[PDB]
Amino acid sequence: ADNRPEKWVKGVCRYCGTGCGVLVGVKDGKAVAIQGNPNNHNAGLLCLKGSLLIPVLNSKERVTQPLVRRHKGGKLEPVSWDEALDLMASRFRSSIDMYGPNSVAWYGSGQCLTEESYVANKIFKGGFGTNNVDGNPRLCMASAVGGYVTSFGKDEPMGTYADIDQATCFFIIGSNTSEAHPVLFRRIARRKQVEPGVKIIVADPRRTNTSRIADMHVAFRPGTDLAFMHSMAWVIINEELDNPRFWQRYVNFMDAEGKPSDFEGYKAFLENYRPEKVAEICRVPVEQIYGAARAFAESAATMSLWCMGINQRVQGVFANNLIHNLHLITGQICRPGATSFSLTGQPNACGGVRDGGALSHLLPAGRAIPNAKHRAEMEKLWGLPEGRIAPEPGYHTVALFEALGRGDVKCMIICETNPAHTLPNLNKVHKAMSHPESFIVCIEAFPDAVTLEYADLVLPPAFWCERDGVYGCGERRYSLTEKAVDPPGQCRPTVNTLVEFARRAGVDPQLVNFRNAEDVWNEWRMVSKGTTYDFWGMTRERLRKESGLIWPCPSEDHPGTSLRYVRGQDPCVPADHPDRFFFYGKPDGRAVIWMRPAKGAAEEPDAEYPLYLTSMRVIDHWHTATMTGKVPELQKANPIAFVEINEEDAARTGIKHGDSVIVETRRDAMELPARVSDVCRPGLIAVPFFDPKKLVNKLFLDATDPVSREPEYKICAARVRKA
Numbered sequence: 001a002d003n004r005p006e007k008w009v010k011g012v013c014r015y016c017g018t019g020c021g022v023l024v025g026v027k028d029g030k031a032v033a034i035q036g037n038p039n040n041h042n043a044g045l046l047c048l049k050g051s052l053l054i055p056v057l058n059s060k061e062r063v064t065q066p067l068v069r070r071h072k073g074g075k076l077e078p079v080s081w082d083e084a085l086d087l088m089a090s091r092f093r094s095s096i097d098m099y100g101p102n103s104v105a106w107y108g109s110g111q112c113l114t115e116e117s118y119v120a121n122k123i124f125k126g127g128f129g130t131n132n133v134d135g136n137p138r139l140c141m142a143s144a145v146g147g148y149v150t151s152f153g154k155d156e157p158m159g160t161y162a163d164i165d166q167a168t169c170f171f172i173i174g175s176n177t178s179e180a181h182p183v184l185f186r187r188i189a190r191r192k193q194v195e196p197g198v199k200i201i202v203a204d205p206r207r208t209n210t211s212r213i214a215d216m217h218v219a220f221r222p223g224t225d226l227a228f229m230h231s232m233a234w235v236i237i238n239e240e241l242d243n244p245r246f247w248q249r250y251v252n253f254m255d256a257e258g259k260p261s262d263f264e265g266y267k268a269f270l271e272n273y274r275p276e277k278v279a280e281i282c283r284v285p286v287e288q289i290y291g292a293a294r295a296f297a298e299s300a301a302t303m304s305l306w307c308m309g310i311n312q313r314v315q316g317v318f319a320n321n322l323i324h325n326l327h328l329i330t331g332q333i334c335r336p337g338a339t340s341f342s343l344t345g346q347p348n349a350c351g352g353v354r355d356g357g358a359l360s361h362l363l364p365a366g367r368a369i370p371n372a373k374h375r376a377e378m379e380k381l382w383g384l385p386e387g388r389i390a391p392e393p394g395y396h397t398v399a400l401f402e403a404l405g406r407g408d409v410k411c412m413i414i415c416e417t418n419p420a421h422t423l424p425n426l427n428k429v430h431k432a433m434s435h436p437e438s439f440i441v442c443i444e445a446f447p448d449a450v451t452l453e454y455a456d457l458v459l460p461p462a463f464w465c466e467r468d469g470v471y472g473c474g475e476r477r478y479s480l481t482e483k484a485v486d487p488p489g490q491c492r493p494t495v496n497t498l499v500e501f502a503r504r505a506g507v508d509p510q511l512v513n514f515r516n517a518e519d520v521w522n523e524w525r526m527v528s529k530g531t532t533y534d535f536w537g538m539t540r541e542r543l544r545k546e547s548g549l550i551w552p553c554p555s556e557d558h559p560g561t562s563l564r565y566v567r568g569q570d571p572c573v574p575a576d577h578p579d580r581f582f583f584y585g586k587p588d589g590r591a592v593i594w595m596r597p598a599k600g601a602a603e604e605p606d607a608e609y610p611l612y613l614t615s616m617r618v619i620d621h622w623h624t625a626t627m628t629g630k631v632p633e634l635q636k637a638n639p640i641a642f643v644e645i646n647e648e649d650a651a652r653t654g655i656k657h658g659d660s661v662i663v664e665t666r667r668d669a670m671e672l673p674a675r676v677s678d679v680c681r682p683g684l685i686a687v688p689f690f691d692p693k694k695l696v697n698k699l700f701l702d703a704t705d706p707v708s709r710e711p712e713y714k715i716c717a718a719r720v721r722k723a
């Protein structure tokens with residue numbers, strides 16, 4: 001008996017792309033409890049961050065009114081919503097009127113609700129006529145996208161979290177699952193517990209909590225995991241552990257010039273990547289290439305999981321291709337427990353930005369800007385005049401902030417991201433963000449986001465479960481979150497803020513015909529209908545009862561889809577297809593192995609800057625800490641930034657534990673407390689990025705993958721010295 005929740009409102013955790021279902025306990029219109037949704041994949045379980053979501057919902061440290069900065073370098077001061085919307089709408093309309101539509105941009109996030117990103121994408125691409133829509137997943141998942149699309153012809157994993165319960169080998173690469181995806185790591189750990197014969201290979205330059213359940217920790221040299229995975233393929237082929245029945249029917253080979261090849265040509269390519277040479281290159285024992293290769297191929301079902309150590313890379317797309325190569329040569333795929341599974345970081349990078357194509361070169365539900373059929377498909381669906389969608393991609397994120405600095409982009413909206421903190425090469429980016437003629441509107445829940453220091457107008461948004469909306473997590477699961485409490489003060493749901501803005505900026509009101517997130521969901525449901533992203537069967541009523549549905553889900557009686565590309569399991573494979581699998585993303589239904597040359601970082605260490613420097617997640621802090629920094633118990637072990645230094649390096653160089661050091665790169669220098677340990681393999685150092693007092697992205701280079709344009713945050717060259 002209670003005082004203490006009167007009702008429980010079903011939703012989704014505000015944090016990771018694990019995408020735990022949550023039940024928010026409310027009493028008297030106020031949130032008082034949280035638990036995990038027993039019916040979602042997480043089966044009632046949350047991590048400590050998710051369990052401490054209620055102090056964040058209830059923090060009075062909020063942006064609760066519209067704010068304006070009258071002059072560049074002035075103080076933010078209160079302003080009405082009607083003054084703010086008019087100022088905003090006039091400014092944008094004006095900029096388009098003088099300079100054309102490409103002077104205005106959207107910079108959004110994988111934390112926005114899918115309905116928020118859908119509306120924004122539509123206002124800009126089909127309303128203003130500019131493809132300047134991008135977002136922070138470009139800094140994260142864009143490499144997993146280029147990898148999946150070139151290997152399979154479609155985006156997203158072909159398996160699910162369920163596959164975890166049935167792998168007997170986990171190949172966990174460039175992923176600190178323990179601290180980035182705690183509930184998922186538990187499911188993996190649980191799997192090894194239930195079945196002790198389960199082999200776990202953790203490949204990562206750093207020895208993290210994740211490696212503590214591994215049978216093998218491959219501490220390779222930063223940048224050499226490509227040569228590693230090629231070497232694995234050499235071993236699998238050399239020891240006849242490959243699956244010819246599979247690759248003969250279901251696989252094409254492209255050579256190092258990206259020209260059609262064959263198995264025989266693959267063998268010959270792989271000759272350049274023998275275990276003995278590669279061991280020397282990777283700085284690992286040769287037995288590890290052999291063990292990893294053998295575990296992977298000989299295991300009854302192998303699942304690979306990776307995150308930012310593979311994506312945040314100039315060879316990002318190719319590294320994803322290389323993981324798919326192993327699953328493709330062995331046919332460890334399209335079977336329960338056997339699958340190539342990219343981990344998604346943000347809660348809604350999948351549904352909001354990837355699936356809904358809210359990047360500069362994309363259009364919703366698998367569509368592409370440079371493809372004329374696609375643009376016309378969208379013009380039909382959006383009731384647009386012919387040729388209204390521009391034929392060329394807008395600015396990707398790095399290019400977008402460069403375009404800002406040059407004054408080519410004059411107006412910008414930032415929504416649920418903190419770019420003045422999380423973009424790479426911050427001294428350059430800060431300069432760009434303070435162009436004396438830029439007009440930067442920030443929609444931002446938290447007064448302490450460093451980005452608000454550059455903003456000309458701030459709009460007060462409804463936070464998390466103060467409004468309703470869908471998040472699509474890493475496993476293709478679309479879960480709704482219902483409104484639990486009212487927003488405080490003058491906070492407003494961004495769907496509505498976006499619609500009122502468009503109307504006032506002269507956008508055709510037929511284009512933003514939306515009263516709520518439910519109206520936008522139905523248009524998007526239609527916009528997906530008959531594409532391989534089809535999620536037409538996920539009605540709002542269905543998503544209120546269900547704890548998520550997994551796409552494809554083409555009708556109301558359809559349960560959703562576990563194994564994509566599988567005959568009889570994926571509704572996109574015709575029931576009378578001749579083969580049991582169909583990688584319909586490719587013209588001939590065959591998936592592609594890519595003989596990608598293994599190179600390295602864009603900035604490799606040398607005599608002057610002898611260390612690899614990296615950057616990483618910590619368990620207690622979500623990104624920029626504007627939310628977790630409000631939970632007293634989440635700093636009890638990580639209040640401040642530090643640098644991890646290898647103990648052999650430290651002993652050699654004279655650096656002792658807790659010593660203050662200067663980390664220095666070509667771009668900046670920064671003093672930090674040193675943690676000395678075996679975490680970093682020799683030659684490597686590491687920094688977290690949660691500390692707004694220690695903006696480590698000032699240190700990192702800006703360099704991007706040429707296909708995905710994802711920055712290489714995971715590697716640059718640094719030197720370390722006593723302060």
Ligand SMILES: Nc1nc2c(c(=O)[nH]1)N[C@H]1C(S)=C(S)[C@@H](COP(=O)(O)OP(=O)(O)OC[C@H]3O[C@@H](n4cnc5c(=O)[nH]c(N)nc54)[C@H](O)[C@@H]3O)O[C@H]1N2
Pocket residue numbers: 016017140173174175176177179180181203204205206208221222223224225307308309310344345346614615616617618619620621622623714715
């Ligand atoms: N606690 C917490 N959890 C989160 C987040 C958070 O901010 N805090 N954010 C979420 C988001 S958006 C994301 S993207 C994920 C990120 O989660 P992860 O990518 O799993 O975590 P990271 O710490 O970025 O890095 C993963 C590992 O890549 C390694 N790495 C470094 N260099 C190399 C290399 O050359 N090759 C390889 N293979 N690996 C290398 C690093 O050593 C690191 O341990 O976390 C999600 N979950």
Ligand SMILES: Nc1nc2c(c(=O)[nH]1)N[C@H]1C(S)=C(S)[C@@H](COP(=O)(O)OP(=O)(O)OC[C@H]3O[C@@H](n4cnc5c(=O)[nH]c(N)nc54)[C@H](O)[C@@H]3O)O[C@H]1N2
Pocket residue numbers: 109111136137139140141308312345346415416417418419421422423442443444445446449461462463464615616622623624625626627689696697700713714
């Ligand atoms: N060095 C380095 N830098 C990195 C990475 C790295 O590995 N290394 N990782 C990159 C990756 S993978 C990612 S995902 C990015 C993430 O980087 P960001 O997205 O920039 O960081 P967050 O703190 O998640 O951004 C969320 C912002 O949204 C605000 N917010 C919360 N709720 C609401 C709301 O309802 N409305 C609005 N308008 N705002 C809200 C929060 O207060 C916060 O300011 O960082 C990237 N940056």
Ligand code: SF4
Pocket residue numbers: 013014015016017018019020042045046047048049050051181182183184
């Ligand atoms: S694992 Fe991620 S989604 Fe689940 S409770 Fe923890 S932070 Fe939230």
Ligand SMILES: [O-][Cl+3]([O-])([O-])[O-]
Pocket residue numbers: 136137138139140141142143145146349353354359
């Ligand atoms: O995951 Cl993306 O950066 O291609 O939206």
Ligand SMILES: [Mo]
Pocket residue numbers: 139140141345346
């Ligand atoms: Mo991310």
